[PDB]
Design an enzyme around this catalytic site. Structure first.
Site, PDB file in Angstrom:
ATOM      1  CE1 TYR A 226      45.609  30.692  48.271  1.00 39.07           C
ATOM      2  CE2 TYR A 226      44.032  30.491  46.471  1.00 39.07           C
ATOM      3  CZ  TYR A 226      44.641  31.251  47.456  1.00 39.07           C
ATOM      4  OH  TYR A 226      44.287  32.571  47.623  1.00 39.07           O
TER       5      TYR A 226
ATOM      6  CB  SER B   9      46.224  38.493  45.687  1.00 41.87           C
ATOM      7  OG  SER B   9      47.584  38.863  45.605  1.00 41.87           O
ATOM      8  CD  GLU B  10      42.460  34.830  45.937  1.00 41.54           C
ATOM      9  OE1 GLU B  10      41.768  35.438  45.091  1.00 41.54           O
ATOM     10  OE2 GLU B  10      42.963  33.703  45.715  1.00 41.54           O
ATOM     11  CB  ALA B  11      41.153  41.584  49.788  1.00 39.90           C
TER      12      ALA B  11
ATOM     13  NE  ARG C 238      43.289  37.196  41.681  1.00 39.31           N
ATOM     14  CZ  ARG C 238      44.172  36.310  42.134  1.00 39.31           C
ATOM     15  NH1 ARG C 238      43.943  35.680  43.280  1.00 39.31           N
ATOM     16  NH2 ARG C 238      45.274  36.041  41.441  1.00 39.31           N
TER      17      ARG C 238
END
Length: 248
Positions: free
Chosen positions: A114, A164-166, A168
């Site tokens: 990030y 990706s974050e969703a 996870r």
């Protein structure tokens, strides 16, 4: 490699899309009744492809490392032909085996962390709007166009969080469902905090196994309103988890 698809003109399919992606990532032994990724896997099963199509009929095939859910690059089009675009510092297996035969291969000057992405995009996560329309706009800005580091970094920031974050975190998936399918939103303090602690949260849950109750030392997290959220019990954080990182 298997492919999961999402058309931005059918936002309501998002929940099904995310669940199908988790199914592809859940290759490890479950812990505390939660899916877990594998630390190592055969090169032929190392990636999952995510086909995202805009209402303008443009598609970008995003490659995700199944061991850590890291986006490593994507394939779009240039001059009527395929073009492979890779982030810097990705696994050698990524640049060697993904998008076979595609000769227009670009290695970006920045990696997928990030910090490097926001520096290239020139906008921080807290200020970048997420959502289906915003994602489509970012795709339209880079698809079939000359390589522009800043615009591409913006695309990665948006897609990494929405996909990706969703995958996870169920909490993040829910934020997108409630605020980003028919609107736009900037990620709150909790969304950002979870993104920064996937590895630590996963190790904590693994350490709590098999009794799966007490978490010690406690996880020092953050609430949606930016207030301290101390987690010392699996039941407190399990509802926000989609899939855990490999380990123990």
């Amino acid at each position: 490699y298997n492919t999961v698809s999402f058309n931005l003109g059918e936002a309501y399919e998002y929940p099904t899309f995310i669940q199908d992606l988790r199914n592809e990532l859940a290759k490890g032994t479950p812990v505390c009744q939660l899916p877990v990724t594998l630390q190592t896997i055969a090169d032929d099963k190392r990636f999952v492809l995510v086909d995202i199509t805009t209402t303008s009929k443009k598609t970008v095939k995003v490659a995700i490392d199944v061991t850590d859910v890291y986006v490593v690059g994507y394939q779009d089009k240039w001059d009527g032909k395929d073009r492979a675009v890779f982030l810097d510092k990705v696994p050698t297996v990524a640049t060697s085996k993904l998008f076979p035969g595609v000769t227009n291969r670009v290695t970006l000057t920045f990696d997928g962390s990030y910090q490097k992405l926001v520096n290239a995009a020139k906008v921080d996560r807290k200020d970048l709007e997420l959502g289906v329309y915003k994602l489509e706009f970012s795709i339209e800005a880079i698809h079939g166009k000359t390589i522009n580091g800043q615009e591409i970094a913006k695309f990665f920031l948006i897609v990494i969080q929405m996909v990706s974050e969703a995958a996870r975190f169920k909490y993040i998936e829910t934020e997108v469902v409630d605020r980003g399918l028919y609107g736009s939103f900037k990620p709150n303090f909790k969304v950002l905090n979870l993104e920064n602690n996937w590895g630590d949260i996963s190790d904590a849950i693994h350490k709590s196994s098999p009794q799966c109750t007490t978490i010690n030392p406690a996880l020092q997290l953050i609430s949606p309103s930016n207030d301290p959220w101390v987690v010392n019990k699996v039941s407190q954080i399990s509802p926000d988890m989609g899939i855990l990182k490999f380990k123990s």
